[PDB]
Design a protein around this ligand. Structure first.
Ligand code: I01
Ligand code: NA
Lengths: 344, 19
């Protein structure tokens, strides 16, 4: 149960925490400027802005630039969340987390220039294909398991796992984007946030909660990859919440019994029985039957052959992304909210 | 079927988070 493999991981995470803390306590600020970048096309949106494909004019490399509107962030009381986002993201470093390359701000906006992950959202492909075979889901699930092992070891909760936030890179692996609700926390926290289908019961019930919410959200993810629909759905949020707290799941008849067993233990309503939140931690997931053919180190090093490589014609190609309406990026001549985002 | 019911639901699109 405990061998030298488990000690190899403990040594790596201990070193990764050292790296993370240096960057956590001394974050990078103001590493570029708006007009170092040609703005091409919107790859997606959110409540306070959008991500755009961009070309760094002096290196010619492509990036994805998040743009947040300071005034809107303030209007909606989401300052501390957008501060965590940048702070967490410039500090982490794992093969399945989107690299934050540059960040800066001007009078109206916050900017996070990330690596461009050209394969599109896992969401897009999952809806198109309908569902993923178990081997295909496990390939992706394994990468979330390792990524959570990293993040939780650093005291981070992610809190918004969904296919919409997993992007596929040129070699067919996941990069996690969207750290908008990621938080460093020792102990419990209480904010009602996340995506309705993926919210753990303890979140819905105002009970206060921990890392374990991310392991519930993985059960949902694995289920939705495998079934093609999430285990609790309904037209409006409230009905999804009712289904989630009842703790009744039905499985499609094609799910293997191993998968059913894994999922009944991730979708445990009881915090004390949930895989991930027991004494062996993540090792109860990794040592489960469903993952018995998973070479965890092979997954970390990216030498497993991916079941699906997205077609990319060249750098700057946006065919794996939906189209959105473009807005011009206005920059006011007076400073919006300087005190509030001064650490950004 | 449950797939059909999901496909006819209002929640097959990109799902926003709440706060
Ligand atoms: C509390 O609410 C918060 C917290 C933090 C935030 O950053 C935001 C946002 O306003 C926000 C703005 C834009 C996006 C966005 O465009 O994200 C896209 C599309 C939505 C689905 N997630 C995928 C994401 N795409 C990428 O990050 C991406 C990265 C690299 N290459 C391609 C895509 C996300 C969040 C936010 F609303
Ligand atoms: Na040994």
């Amino acid at each position: 149960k405990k061998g030298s493999e488990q000690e190899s991981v403990k040594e790596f995470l201990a070193k990764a925490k050292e790296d993370f803390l240096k960057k956590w306590e001394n974050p990078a600020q103001n590493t570029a400027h708006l007009d170092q970048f040609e703005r091409i096309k919107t790859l997606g949106t959110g409540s306070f802005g959008r991500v755009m494909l961009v070309k760094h004019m002096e290196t010619g490399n492509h990036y994805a630039m998040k743009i947040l509107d300071k005034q809107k962030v303030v209007k909606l009381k989401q300052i501390e969340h957008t501060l965590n986002e940048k702070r967490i993201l410039q500090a982490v470093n794992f093969p399945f987390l989107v690299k934050l390359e540059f960040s800066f701000k001007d009078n109206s906006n916050l900017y996070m220039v990330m690596e461009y992950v050209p394969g599109g959202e896992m969401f897009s492909h999952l809806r198109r294909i309908g569902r993923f075979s178990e081997p295909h889901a496990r390939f992706y699930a394994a990468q979330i398991v390792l990524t959570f092992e990293y993040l939780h070891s650093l005291d981070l909760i992610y809190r918004d796992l969904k296919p919409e936030n997993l992007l596929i890179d040129q070699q067919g692996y996941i990069q996690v984007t969207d750290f908008g609700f990621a938080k460093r926390v020792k102990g419990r926290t209480w904010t009602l946030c996340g995506t309705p289908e993926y919210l753990a019961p303890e979140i819905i019930l105002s009970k206060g909660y921990n890392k374990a919410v991310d392991w519930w959200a993985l059960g949902v993810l694995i289920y939705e990859m495998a079934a093609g629909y999430p285990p609790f759905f309904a037209d409006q949020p409230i009905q999804i919440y009712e289904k989630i707290v009842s703790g009744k799941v039905r499985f499609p008849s094609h799910f293997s019994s191993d998968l059913k067993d894994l999922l009944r233990n991730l979708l445990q309503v009881d915090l004390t029985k949930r895989f991930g939140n027991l004494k062996n931690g993540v090792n109860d997931i990794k040592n489960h039957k469903w993952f018995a053919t998973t070479d965890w180190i092979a997954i970390y090093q990216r030498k497993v052959e991916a079941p699906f490589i997205p077609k990319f014609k060249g750098p700057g190609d946006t065919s794996n992304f939906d189209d959105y309406e473009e807005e011009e990026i206005r920059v006011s001549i007076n400073e919006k909210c300087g005190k509030e985002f001064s650490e950004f | 079927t449950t797939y059909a019911d999901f496909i006819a639901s209002g929640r097959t699109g990109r799902r926003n988070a709440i706060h």
